[PDB]
Design a protein around this ligand. Structure first.
Ligand SMILES: Nc1ncnc2c1ncn2[C@H]1C[C@H](O)[C@@H](COP(=O)(O)OP(=O)(O)OP(=O)(O)O)O1
Ligand code: SF4
Ligand SMILES: [Ca+2]
Length: 1123
DNA sequence: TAACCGCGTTC
DNA sequence: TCTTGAACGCGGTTA
């Protein structure tokens, strides 16, 4: 059926590609040098691989192959095709009677099967695969993917009919071919992934296409220079609505092509003609913009396509172009009966993203959200441009853009152009290098590299490794539709994750004194530990053995000259040293060190049957993780007893209009069971969820095939590279190479380059840890993720134990800790080496490191020495190191309003430089929140730097508080009408459409309903709507939820504006629309109030300063405490 | 009061 | 058909 339907595309695609100068090259025939040793003496064409897609090709049904797109050495492009049979495996019950399994499949699959061979693969779930026993399978090959699916169609029944009971007939009778089929395997490998992997081909790599196949020209250093072009469209829009593809037209289309810039004008909307101008925001981002003022909306769409057809771009960049730009251009093209596909080769795909054959479509927004490391309230185009490229792009109000078409066009023109310059340069300096480089190791084309989840990226990488060690791939994981425990149905099970702690709140500055009580037995402990830990510091930390220089004494003396003077005066009070320490790449290093991988986790049945179960098991490492389950207090009895009704069908047809318990699929059934089961639990239990913890043990086999571990290490290594250059470049020519009088921002450009790159790998890296819990994961282990976490806790806790005994740790999260230490503590030294240069030694860091190494070091790490003879060599492995952040000027931690309880994961930090070092958690950073608190927070944090003493510090702070108070107490009469509105608004996102919030109450929720009635049905068409709202004063004595009002009315017609304000306050006699009359200042007075107590006041108190802002008082407990 | 829920952060 | 994790904060309701 489909092979013709699917070869339509193939032929269509082939024509389009050819249109763009992608003619299907075929190489000369050669018999001789087949080895890649003499690559020149082999005929063919050298090309840089830019792209690859799955295709069907007729004889030269249809046969599955892969189109590969190249740029030649000469300039201009070409294409080539590898054909390669889709394939998968049948597993077998008893590995004896396999010819019999090959016999019946050969017969049963005559319709679709092409080829059949028995093969062997390693399989890490087989008893002694470590001793060379390989698992046997039948390899099923097809001429195409479609044929392969047909096979999976014909196998599923027997896979299911064999999973169910064989039902006898002669019940007195004192096997069949089919019943030996164990399972099916590697059947869902995306086809192009299959080729890319099997043939070892990767985009970004240089190949010569030859008769024999592809040869990586491993000699060509750097990538080619694809023609990139990045666009942005400007759109007409109603007041207070979103652009619509039916009613609305496209004002402008701005774009760039390798630094040459362009703008296309709809003259029917843009009144004035527009003149060639320039927008060069910084000097490194040149944008000359010649313009094409075009008569019709059509001539605009057609001047667009024509240019793209001319320049022939293999990359087309956009900012969120997938969900706005492209679908707008497409629908407005459908209007005029233009065919975008026929015109530029782009169409939707089965996920609604716009992709083309020849040209990758690189939606920078996907990078931004996945890989930028920016918070959600910075994933905006503006803020990205700010953060990433270091400048402010032209701003323009949305509701203005449609007006500014007529009135002020040159203004809007310059903005449209800015959207593009920010996109093109964002792409080139950040996206292009990352993705294209990443494709050289990941078997995906650039579009999927950019888009796939980071969990998937990990999977791909793990597949190449597993393939290349001939390891059979486990099937995707499947979750039980319900689990139980101690009789109780399970709600959710996980493991105890990270260990977080707030210890002390308040301001801590370098110029303000602090009181310390140094544990005496700790500095005794560390006095003993100084020799090894400093030999350590040189033997590993710099790995430079010992006595590289002489100072090993001129330093081991100087350290004690502070450690001794400390132990006697073990209660001092002076200036602080504010330090963060944080284990670099914790979970990955914890994993590599403990040789942690899903397959490395064995049971009783597993570890026993192993032929290394001899005397002196040095290969079974015992590690503890903490399981946690959430269940109903209903035991076996009640649980079982809630079998209950099973008789309320109540569901739909397509004449059906009737069902039963057992007529609803087990999903729907279990959904209903959810409801009923909740009732009996709370009714008899006095709770609706019990959560208990049990320490589990797990056996981490040290001998297992480390394809997973090794992959993690490889990716960590990949990353440390950039964390090397990042640290290098921080002092390389930023610290000591310039005099600050030589404007070399060049090093400042590199640091953002490498800081971004190193971060961009962070999430993929840690996704090697997360992955083992991902759904539809091929290598699932709760145990492993469990063990990794708890080990992390243990490591950080133990490190706190020491620090609290030797200073005051402020805050602590997972792998990192903040602490002030005494200002006369052994800081950082430079053990000097004879060979000229000097190393770096920070005693606090190296102090912890030795203890890590002397307490959590894998002494069981076995690795395979002699393949043929199965000889493992044990050795000692530990890659866990703390890293210091240098000493900071200040640090502010909020305190809770609840009593004793602190606030974790929020704080502000400042450099001796004076600049804001780090800011965490706060509403200022987060998307939405109350714009008041945000600007307050903006204003406030800096001001913790003013003031001469701790007491006097909170003063300059307290001023700002009162300032901001005098704006609320003054019922915002101190603030301009236009200005105020913004400052008072609170912006929230709904992540789902409004329909899917059935029976919940929230400001976002009702704002949505309100927008809905006011501006219309379309207003909640789709998910992700921003709810901009103020909370009204009336009705008095009514829940907050109810008084959420969209700020849109406050720019809408007065009749409508009244009818709704009156409606929304149950106040029909409402006549006053005064924006300030409706605003419930009393509420907004508490919120700003909470902020003050959180940041300023309760922290003030806990540091024994009298409340500095009495216009908001202590809670009854903070009062009832001072007594 | 305590248990929740949704967002959106920190790890 | 896509699909890393768990610990927190906070405003808000729910029982
Ligand atoms: N994005 C994440 N996904 C899954 N786990 C994460 C993620 N981020 C952090 N973690 C967990 C695993 C990390 O090892 C642990 C420590 O936090 P953090 O220090 O930010 O990561 P890291 O230690 O791996 O980075 P760095 O090496 O830069 O310190 O937090
Ligand atoms: S832990 Fe030791 S005995 Fe158990 S499977 Fe691994 S190598 Fe064999
Ligand atoms: Ca870390």
């Amino acid at each position: 059926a489909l092979s013709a339907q699917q070869l339509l595309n193939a032929s269509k695609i082939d024509d389009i590609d050819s249109m763009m100068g992608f003619e299907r090259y075929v190489p000369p025939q050669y018999n001789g040098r087949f080895d890649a040793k003499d690559i020149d003496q082999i005929p063919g064409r050298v090309g840089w691989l830019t792209n690859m897609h799955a295709t069907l090709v007729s004889q030269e049904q249809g046969i599955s192959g892969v189109d590969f797109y190249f740029l030649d050495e000469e300039g201009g492009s070409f294409k080539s095709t590898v054909v390669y049979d889709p394939y998968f495996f049948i597993a077998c019950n008893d590995e004896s009677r396999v010819n019999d399994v090959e016999e019946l499949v050969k017969k049963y699959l005559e319709s679709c099967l092409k080829s059949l061979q028995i093969i062997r693969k390693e399989d890490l779930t087989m008893d002694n695969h470590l001793l060379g026993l390989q698992k046997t399978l039948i390899k099923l090959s097809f001429v195409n993917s479609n044929q392969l699916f047909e096979a999976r169609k014909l196998l599923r029944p027997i896979l299911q009919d064999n999973a169910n009971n064989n039902v006898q007939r002669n019940i007195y009778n004192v096997v069949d071919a089919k019943h030996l089929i164990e399972d099916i395997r590697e059947y869902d490998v995306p086809y192009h992934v299959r080729v890319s992997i099997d043939k070892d081909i990767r985009v970004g790599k240089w190949y010569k296409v030859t008769q024999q196949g592809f040869i990586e020209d491993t000699r060509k250093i750097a990538f080619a220079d694809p023609v990139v072009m990045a666009f942005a469209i400007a759109t007409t829009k109603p007041p207070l609505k979103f652009p619509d593809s039916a009613v609305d037209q496209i004002m402008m289309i701005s774009y760039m092509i390798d630094g040459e810039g362009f703008l296309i004008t709809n003259r029917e909307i843009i009144s004035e003609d527009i003149e060639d101008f320039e927008y060069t925001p910084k000097p490194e981002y040149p944008g000359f913009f010649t313009i094409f003022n075009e008569n019709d909306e059509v001539a605009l769409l057609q001047r667009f396509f024509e240019h793209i057809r001319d320049v022939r771009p293999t990359v087309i960049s956009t900012f969120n172009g997938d969900f706005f730009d492209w679908p707008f251009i497409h629908n407005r093209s459908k209007i005029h009966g233009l065919d975008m596909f026929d015109e530029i080769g782009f169409a939707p795909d089965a996920e609604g993203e716009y992709k083309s054959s020849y040209c990758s479509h690189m939606d920078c927004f996907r990078w931004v959200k996945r890989d930028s490391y920016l918070p959600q309230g910075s994933q905006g185009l503006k803020a990205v441009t700010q953060s990433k490229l270091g400048y402010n792009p032209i701003e323009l109000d949305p509701e203005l853009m449609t007006p500014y078409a007529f009135e002020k066009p040159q203004h809007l023109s310059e903005y449209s152009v800015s959207d593009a310059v920010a996109t093109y340069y964002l792409y080139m300096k950040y996206v292009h290098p990352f993705i294209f480089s990443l494709c050289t190791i990941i078997p995906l084309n650039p579009d999927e590299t950019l888009r796939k989840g980071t969990g998937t990226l990990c999977e791909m990488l793990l597949m190449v490794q597993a393939y290349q060690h001939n390891i059979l791939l486990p099937n995707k994981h499947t979750d039980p539709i319900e689990r139980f425990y101690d009789g109780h149905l399970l709600e959710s099970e996980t493991y105890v994750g990270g260990h977080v702690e707030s210890l002390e709140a308040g301001v801590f500055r370098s110029d303000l004194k602090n009181e310390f009580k140094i544990d005496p037995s700790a500095i005794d402990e560390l006095l003993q530990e100084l020799p090894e830990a400093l030999k350590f510091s040189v033997e590993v930390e710099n790995k430079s053995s010992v006595d590289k220089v002489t100072n090993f004494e001129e330093i081991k003396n100087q350290i004690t000259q502070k450690l001794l003077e400390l132990k006697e005066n073990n209660i001092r009070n002076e200036l602080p040293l504010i330090y963060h320490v944080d284990v670099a790449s914790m979970y990955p290093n914890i994993m590599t060190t403990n040789r942690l991988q899903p397959d490395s986790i064995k049971a009783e049945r597993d570890c026993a049957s192993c032929d290394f179960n001899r005397p002196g098991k040095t290969c079974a490492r015992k590690l503890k993780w903490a399981w946690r389950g959430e269940f109903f207090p209903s035991k076996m009895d009640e649980y079982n007893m809630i079998k209950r009704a099973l008789q309320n069908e109540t569901f739909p047809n397509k004449k059906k209009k009737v069902l039963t318990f057992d007529e609803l699929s087990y999903a729907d059934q279990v959904i209903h069971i959810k409801k009923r089961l909740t009732e009996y639990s709370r009714k008899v239990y006095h709770r609706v969820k019990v959560s208990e913890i049990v320490e589990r043990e797990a056996i981490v086999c040290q001998r297992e095939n480390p394809f997973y571990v090794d992959t993690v290490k490889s990716f960590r290594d990949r990353r440390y590279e950039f964390k090397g250059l990042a640290k290098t470049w921080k002092g390389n020519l930023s610290k000591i190479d310039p005099s600050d009088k030589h404007a070399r921002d060049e090093a400042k450009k590199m640091i953002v380059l490498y800081d971004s790159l190193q971060l961009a790998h962070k999430v993929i890296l840690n996704s090697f840890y997360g992955y083992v819990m991902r759904k539809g994961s091929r290598w699932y282990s709760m145990e492993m993720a469990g063990i990794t976490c708890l080990t992390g806790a243990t490591i950080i806790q133990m490190a706190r134990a020491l620090v609290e005994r030797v200073g005051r740790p402020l805050e602590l999260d997972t792998d990192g800790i903040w602490c002030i230490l005494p200002k006369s503590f052994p800081e950082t030294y430079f053990f000097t080496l004879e060979n000229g240069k000097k190393l770096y030694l920070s005693y606090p860091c190296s102090m912890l490191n030795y203890r890590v190494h002397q307490k959590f070091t894998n002494h069981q790490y076995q690795e395979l020495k002699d393949p043929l003879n199965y000889i493992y060599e044990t050795h000692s492995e530990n890659t866990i190191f703390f890293e210091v952040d240098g000493p900071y000027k200040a640090m502010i931690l909020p305190s809770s309003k609840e009593e004793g309880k602190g606030i974790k994961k929020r704080y502000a930090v400042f450099n001796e430089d004076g600049s804001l070092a780090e800011l965490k958690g706060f509403e200022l950073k987060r998307r939405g929140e109350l714009q008041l608190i945000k600007n307050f927070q903006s204003d406030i944090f800096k001001v913790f730097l003013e003031g001469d003493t701790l007491e006097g510090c909170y003063s300059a702070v307290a001023s700002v508080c009162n300032r901001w108070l005098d704006v609320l107490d003054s019922h915002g009469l101190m603030l301009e009408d236009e200005d105020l509105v913004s400052l008072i608004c609170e912006n929230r996102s709904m992540s789902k459409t409004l329909k899917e919030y059935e029976g919940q109450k929230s400001t976002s929720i009702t704002t949505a309903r309100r927008l809905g009635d006011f501006l219309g049905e379309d207003m909640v068409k789709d998910k992700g709507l921003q709810c901009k709202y103020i909370i009204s004063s009336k009705p008095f004595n009514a829940p907050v939820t109810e008084r959420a009002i969209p700020v849109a009315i406050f720019s809408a017609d007065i009749p409508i504006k009244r009818s709704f304000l009156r409606r929304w306050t149950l106040d029909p006699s409402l006549e006053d629309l005064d924006i300030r009359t409706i605003i419930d200042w009393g509420y907004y007075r508490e919120r700003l109030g909470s902020a003050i107590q959180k940041i300023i006041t309760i922290p003030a108190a806990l540091q024994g300063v009298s409340n500095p802002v009495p216009r908001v008082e202590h809670p009854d407990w903070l009062k009832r405490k001072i007594a």
